Write a protein that holds these residues in place. Structure first.
Motif, mmCIF file in Angstrom:
data_model
loop_
_atom_site.group_PDB
_atom_site.id
_atom_site.type_symbol
_atom_site.label_atom_id
_atom_site.label_comp_id
_atom_site.label_asym_id
_atom_site.label_seq_id
_atom_site.Cartn_x
_atom_site.Cartn_y
_atom_site.Cartn_z
ATOM 1 N N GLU A 65 17.723 0.710 -7.281
ATOM 2 C CA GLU A 65 18.738 -0.017 -6.516
ATOM 3 C C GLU A 65 19.739 0.874 -5.788
ATOM 4 O O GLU A 65 19.945 0.662 -4.581
ATOM 5 N N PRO A 66 20.379 1.864 -6.426
ATOM 6 C CA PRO A 66 21.491 2.558 -5.752
ATOM 7 C C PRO A 66 21.103 3.294 -4.470
ATOM 8 O O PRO A 66 21.959 3.450 -3.591
ATOM 9 N N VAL A 67 19.858 3.747 -4.318
ATOM 10 C CA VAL A 67 19.470 4.489 -3.122
ATOM 11 C C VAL A 67 18.513 3.727 -2.213
ATOM 12 O O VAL A 67 18.375 4.111 -1.039
ATOM 13 N N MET A 68 17.818 2.695 -2.700
ATOM 14 C CA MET A 68 16.895 1.987 -1.818
ATOM 15 C C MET A 68 17.464 0.712 -1.208
ATOM 16 O O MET A 68 16.807 0.123 -0.339
ATOM 17 N N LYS A 69 18.669 0.302 -1.612
ATOM 18 C CA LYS A 69 19.512 -0.668 -0.907
ATOM 19 C C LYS A 69 19.091 -2.117 -1.148
ATOM 20 O O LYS A 69 19.876 -3.039 -0.924
ATOM 21 N N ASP A 70 17.868 -2.339 -1.606
ATOM 22 C CA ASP A 70 17.425 -3.679 -1.977
ATOM 23 C C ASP A 70 16.189 -3.516 -2.855
ATOM 24 O O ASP A 70 15.870 -2.404 -3.291
ATOM 25 N N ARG A 71 15.484 -4.616 -3.114
ATOM 26 C CA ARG A 71 14.393 -4.586 -4.093
ATOM 27 C C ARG A 71 13.164 -3.897 -3.523
ATOM 28 O O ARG A 71 12.773 -4.142 -2.375
ATOM 29 N N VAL A 72 12.555 -3.031 -4.337
ATOM 30 C CA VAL A 72 11.332 -2.326 -3.963
ATOM 31 C C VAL A 72 10.132 -3.120 -4.462
ATOM 32 O O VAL A 72 10.282 -4.093 -5.209
ATOM 33 N N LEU A 73 8.932 -2.713 -4.042
ATOM 34 C CA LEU A 73 7.747 -3.506 -4.341
ATOM 35 C C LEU A 73 7.488 -3.557 -5.841
ATOM 36 O O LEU A 73 7.162 -4.619 -6.382
ATOM 37 N N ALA A 74 7.646 -2.423 -6.529
ATOM 38 C CA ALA A 74 7.303 -2.367 -7.950
ATOM 39 C C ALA A 74 8.175 -3.279 -8.800
ATOM 40 O O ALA A 74 7.789 -3.606 -9.928
ATOM 41 N N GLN A 75 9.307 -3.745 -8.276
ATOM 42 C CA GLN A 75 10.182 -4.663 -8.996
ATOM 43 C C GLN A 75 9.747 -6.117 -8.894
ATOM 44 O O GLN A 75 10.319 -6.956 -9.603
ATOM 45 N N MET A 76 8.834 -6.451 -7.978
ATOM 46 C CA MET A 76 8.396 -7.829 -7.766
ATOM 47 C C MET A 76 7.250 -8.217 -8.710
ATOM 48 O O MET A 76 6.669 -7.380 -9.396
ATOM 49 N N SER A 77 6.951 -9.521 -8.758
ATOM 50 C CA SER A 77 5.871 -10.053 -9.586
ATOM 51 C C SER A 77 5.322 -11.304 -8.916
ATOM 52 O O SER A 77 5.850 -11.771 -7.901
ATOM 53 N N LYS A 82 2.257 -9.974 -4.842
ATOM 54 C CA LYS A 82 0.897 -9.954 -4.311
ATOM 55 C C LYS A 82 0.895 -9.976 -2.794
ATOM 56 O O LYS A 82 0.203 -9.183 -2.147
ATOM 57 N N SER A 83 1.661 -10.891 -2.208
ATOM 58 C CA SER A 83 1.628 -11.048 -0.767
ATOM 59 C C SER A 83 2.282 -9.862 -0.071
ATOM 60 O O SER A 83 1.819 -9.434 0.991
ATOM 61 N N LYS A 84 3.338 -9.291 -0.655
ATOM 62 C CA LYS A 84 4.013 -8.206 0.047
ATOM 63 C C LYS A 84 3.263 -6.895 -0.126
ATOM 64 O O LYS A 84 3.226 -6.075 0.806
ATOM 65 N N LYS A 85 2.640 -6.704 -1.288
ATOM 66 C CA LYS A 85 1.724 -5.582 -1.461
ATOM 67 C C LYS A 85 0.587 -5.647 -0.450
ATOM 68 O O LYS A 85 0.206 -4.623 0.123
ATOM 69 N N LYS A 86 0.055 -6.849 -0.194
ATOM 70 C CA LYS A 86 -0.986 -7.025 0.816
ATOM 71 C C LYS A 86 -0.489 -6.653 2.222
ATOM 72 O O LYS A 86 -1.211 -6.007 3.001
ATOM 73 N N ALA A 87 0.735 -7.063 2.570
ATOM 74 C CA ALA A 87 1.308 -6.700 3.862
ATOM 75 C C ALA A 87 1.417 -5.192 4.003
ATOM 76 O O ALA A 87 1.144 -4.634 5.076
ATOM 77 N N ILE A 88 1.832 -4.516 2.931
ATOM 78 C CA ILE A 88 1.978 -3.070 2.989
ATOM 79 C C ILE A 88 0.618 -2.413 3.162
ATOM 80 O O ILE A 88 0.449 -1.519 4.001
ATOM 81 N N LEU A 89 -0.367 -2.845 2.365
ATOM 82 C CA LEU A 89 -1.734 -2.344 2.506
ATOM 83 C C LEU A 89 -2.223 -2.458 3.945
ATOM 84 O O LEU A 89 -2.930 -1.569 4.454
ATOM 85 N N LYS A 90 -1.854 -3.554 4.613
ATOM 86 C CA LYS A 90 -2.349 -3.846 5.949
ATOM 87 C C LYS A 90 -2.024 -2.707 6.899
ATOM 88 O O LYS A 90 -2.864 -2.315 7.725
ATOM 89 N N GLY A 91 -0.820 -2.139 6.777
ATOM 90 C CA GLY A 91 -0.406 -1.046 7.656
ATOM 91 C C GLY A 91 -1.177 0.241 7.446
ATOM 92 O O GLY A 91 -1.005 1.202 8.209
ATOM 93 N N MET A 92 -2.045 0.283 6.452
ATOM 94 C CA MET A 92 -2.729 1.534 6.172
ATOM 95 C C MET A 92 -4.216 1.288 5.974
ATOM 96 O O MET A 92 -4.910 2.093 5.342
ATOM 97 N N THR A 93 -4.720 0.208 6.557
ATOM 98 C CA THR A 93 -6.123 -0.151 6.465
ATOM 99 C C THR A 93 -6.493 -0.753 7.796
ATOM 100 O O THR A 93 -5.652 -0.849 8.701
ATOM 101 N N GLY A 94 -7.760 -1.137 7.934
ATOM 102 C CA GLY A 94 -8.167 -1.811 9.159
ATOM 103 C C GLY A 94 -7.822 -1.023 10.409
ATOM 104 O O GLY A 94 -7.843 0.211 10.433
ATOM 105 N N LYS A 95 -7.514 -1.766 11.482
ATOM 106 C CA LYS A 95 -7.190 -1.156 12.771
ATOM 107 C C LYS A 95 -5.927 -0.302 12.688
ATOM 108 O O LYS A 95 -5.781 0.659 13.445
ATOM 109 N N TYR A 96 -4.993 -0.644 11.799
ATOM 110 C CA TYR A 96 -3.835 0.221 11.599
ATOM 111 C C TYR A 96 -4.262 1.606 11.121
ATOM 112 O O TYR A 96 -3.764 2.627 11.617
ATOM 113 N N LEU A 97 -5.208 1.655 10.183
ATOM 114 C CA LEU A 97 -5.758 2.921 9.712
ATOM 115 C C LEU A 97 -6.515 3.658 10.819
ATOM 116 O O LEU A 97 -6.372 4.883 10.967
#
Ligand code: HEM
Ligand SMILES: c1ccc(-c2c[nH]cn2)cc1
Length: 391
Positions: A65-77, A82-97
């Motif tokens: 919290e003190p340096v990342m300013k809001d919630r990071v992915l590993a804090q979610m459930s 699931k959906s936000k991890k998928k969004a992040i994956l998207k930027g590093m796979t497929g045509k983005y990759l």
């Protein structure tokens, strides 16, 4: 009473004898200085990471919290994670990759081109430190005009994320790094907001969950999370890869002769010198491993490097061998396992293989100049320098 502490100076110098002592004699080991239990065996680490409901990631909220300013992915459930991890994956796979890797080839070749006539390069300080942050910014969509300042600010935030019991002057410097990075990144998130591009920030920007976008500061937090994560372990791994191969000439030759072996060499480097060494979790209810009683609210810290060298998981575990196959072999825990397994795992392996191929292609007859590395860090860990020469 116990006398083998994770925080002895000897541990950071060389933690391997500690892994062997702990796994055999104190596999759930208490450290009073941070009120946490360190978990060293492959089976216990695997069980903890696979059981996200008993061992949760609330410990990470306190350290992020003190340096990342809001919630990071590993804090979610649940669905949010699931959906936000998928969004992040998207930027590093497929045509983005597909769009990104030529750019990272350009980053690789521009670094090589700066040192090629000098006939030596420090894989840590000349290549990895420069490449890792540029690569993270390319992935996010941040122009490289300020990679000098980004590198500096990333380093202070990383120090906070990866340390225990920092002194008040240190926290201050890390928070000013975090503020400067926010002060830089926030306007760009807002520019990307009305001029959407094809990068990870734009993905987060167009993310929608039941007709409800995520706040700008949440986007900043996720972007900061990716910036830190895509940068820190990748540079250490590259230096470990070439050091280990050069220290085993026969295996370096097999790699050179058969480039398909580079992926296995990368995987074995991650097993042998796990760059992310610790993973904390909070115990949700009374629980026992071996004969060590844990209570609700206790903290367990998985010892990834120790687990990856567990002789119950691997035969000859303290030996580097790119030819491991299949107990005598198991999946390593270098990227964790279970709900929070590294979203960047596949991308990491592709990045490192493409960089490894270019270095082998362009630097001919590589020889080791750093015959003995020194390693630092107990949370993330890598060589301070790793110089090679070439023709
Ligand atoms: C050699 C490179 C890398 C290693 C060794 C590594 C290691 C790890 C480990 C051990 C975890 C689990 C943490 C936990 O369970 O609490 C993790 C998660 C994560 N990693 Fe990496 N990682 C690497 C590269 C990357 C890259 C390139 C990215 C780019 C985004 C990334 C982003 C993440 C994120 C966002 C998480 C949290 C995922 C989740 O909570 O579901 N990592 N990583
Ligand atoms: C601390 C904890 C985890 C990391 C990480 C996860 N994935 C990549 N890097 C970096 C620093």
């Amino acid at each position: 009473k116990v006398y083998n502490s994770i925080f002895d100076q000897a541990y950071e110098i060389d933690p391997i004898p500690y892994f062997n002592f702990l796994r055999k004699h104190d596999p759930v080991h208490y450290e009073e200085s941070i009120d946490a239990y360190f978990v060293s065996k492959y089976k216990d680490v695997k069980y903890i990471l696979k059981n996200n409901d008993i061992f949760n990631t609330k410990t990470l909220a306190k350290r992020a919290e003190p340096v990342m300013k809001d919630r990071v992915l590993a804090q979610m459930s649940g669905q949010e994670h699931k959906s936000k991890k998928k969004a992040i994956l998207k930027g590093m796979t497929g045509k983005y990759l597909e769009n990104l890797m030529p750019i990272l080839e350009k980053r690789t070749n521009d670094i090589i081109n700066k040192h090629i006539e000098k006939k030596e390069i420090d894989i840590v300080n000349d290549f990895g430190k420069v490449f890792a942050v540029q690569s993270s910014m390319d992935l996010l969509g941040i122009n490289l005009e300020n990679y000098e300042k980004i590198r500096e600010w990333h380093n202070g935030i990383a120090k906070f994320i990866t340390s225990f019991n920092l002194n008040d002057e240190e926290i201050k410097y890390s928070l000013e790094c975090s503020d400067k990075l926010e002060n830089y990144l926030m306007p760009l998130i807002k520019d990307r907001k009305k001029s959407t591009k094809d990068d990870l920030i734009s993905i987060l920007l167009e993310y929608k969950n039941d007709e409800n976008s995520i706040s700008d500061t949440e986007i900043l937090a996720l972007s900061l999370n990716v910036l830190l994560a895509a940068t820190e372990p990748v540079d250490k791994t590259l230096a470990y890869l070439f050091y280990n191969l050069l220290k085993n000439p026969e295996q370096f030759e097999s790699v050179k002769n058969n480039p398909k072996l580079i992926k296995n060499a990368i995987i074995e480097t991650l097993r042998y010198n796990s760059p992310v060494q610790l993973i904390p979790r909070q115990v949700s209810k009374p629980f026992i491993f071996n004969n060590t009683e844990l209570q609700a609210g206790d903290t367990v810290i998985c010892m990834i490097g120790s687990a990856n060298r567990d002789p119950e998981a691997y035969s000859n575990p303290d030996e580097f061998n790119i030819h491991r196959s299949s107990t005598s072999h198991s999946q390593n825990l270098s990227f964790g396992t279970g709900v929070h397994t590294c979203v960047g795992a596949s991308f990491s392996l592709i990045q490192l293989e493409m960089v490894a191929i270019l270095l082998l292609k362009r630097l001919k007859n590589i020889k080791l100049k750093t015959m003995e590395i020194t390693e630092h860090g107990i949370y993330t860990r890598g060589p301070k320098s790793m110089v090679i020469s070439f023709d």
